[PDB]
Design a protein around this ligand. Sequence first.
Ligand SMILES: *[C@@H]1O[C@H](CO)[C@@H](O)[C@H](O)[C@H]1NC(C)=O
Lengths: 48, 49
Amino acid sequence: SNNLDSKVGGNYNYLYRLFRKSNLKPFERDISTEIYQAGSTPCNGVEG
Amino acid sequence: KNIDGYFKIYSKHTPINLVRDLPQGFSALEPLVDLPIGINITRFQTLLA
Ligand SMILES: *[C@@H]1O[C@H](CO)[C@@H](O)[C@H](O)[C@H]1NC(C)=O
């Protein structure tokens, strides 16, 4: 699709979930936008 | 029930004569329809008239 999906420097219409608290079962769609917390410190919707 | 997102609907209707609680008798349900929706159902509610 490089002749199509590639536009200028990037296309943000196609996104993905990079982080998840565990391994998700197959054939599942996760729309949760919650910030991934790897520690015990509360993220509160911001990076840190 | 569900299998990998396949909702299994098994419907059986038989006439009975009952006061309260449950009658004692054997029943084998039959499939009605199939709804391969593929969504997670964590809760349900019964609708009444
Ligand atoms: C449905 O959600 C429950 C509670 O989060 C989870 O335990 C279960 O694995 C989920 N099932 C499916 C089919 O996604």
